[PDB]
Amino acid sequence: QAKENEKKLKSMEAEMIQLQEELAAAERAKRQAQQERDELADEIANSSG
Amino acid sequence: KGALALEEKRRLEARIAQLEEELEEEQGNTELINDRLKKANLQIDQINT
């Protein structure tokens, strides 16, 4: 049962690992958007402004 | 829009500048016609006397 129970741990790790895949990309998306939401914004006031 | 906005001023700049020559025509007339009156009034005054 220990080996069988361990299989559920590695299987459940896929959920945490899968969530980290989307969480890492989703969290990184904020950095990319923030770098562009502020850089272009400051430049928009200089170019468009 | 920014590049076109700056270029838009060039179009009006030439129009506002070319329009100055048109306005100078009436402005020059006030100085040319009035100047001609001085030469004409001088002869008209001498002819009258």
From Swiss-Prot, chain A:
It is found in: Cytoplasm, Cytoskeleton; Cytoplasm, Cell cortex; Cytoplasmic vesicle, Secretory vesicle, Cortical granule; Cell membrane. It comes from the Eukaryota. Cellular myosin that appears to play a role in cytokinesis, cell shape, and specialized functions such as secretion and capping. Required for cortical actin clearance prior to oocyte exocytosis. Promotes cell motility in conjunction with S100A4. During cell spreading, plays an important role in cytoskeleton reorganization, focal contact formation (in the margins but not the central part of spreading cells), and lamellipodial retraction; this function is mechanically antagonized by MYH10. (Microbial infection) Acts as a receptor for herpes simplex virus 1/HHV-1 envelope glycoprotein B. The modification Phosphoserine is found at residue 48. This is Myosin-9. The lineage of its organism: Eukaryota, Metazoa, Chordata, Craniata, Vertebrata. Myosin is a hexameric protein that consists of 2 heavy chain subunits (MHC), 2 alkali light chain subunits (MLC) and 2 regulatory light chain subunits (MLC-2). Interacts with RASIP1. Interacts with DDR1. Interacts with PDLIM2. Interacts with SVIL. Interacts with HTRA3. Interacts with Myo7a. Interacts with CFAP95. Interacts with LIMCH1; independently of the integration of MYH9 into the myosin complex. Interacts with RAB3A. Interacts with ZBED4. Interacts with S100A4; this interaction increases cell motility. (Microbial infection) Interacts with herpes simplex virus 1/HHV-1 envelope glycoprotein B. It is linked to Macrothrombocytopenia and granulocyte inclusions with or without nephritis or sensorineural hearing loss: An autosomal dominant disorder characterized by thrombocytopenia, giant platelets and Dohle body-like inclusions in peripheral blood leukocytes with variable ultrastructural appearance. Some affected individuals lack leukocyte inclusion bodies on classic staining of peripheral blood smears. Alport syndrome-like features of nephritis, hearing loss, and eye abnormalities are present in some patients. Deafness, autosomal dominant, 17: A form of deafness characterized by progressive high frequency hearing impairment and cochleosaccular degeneration.
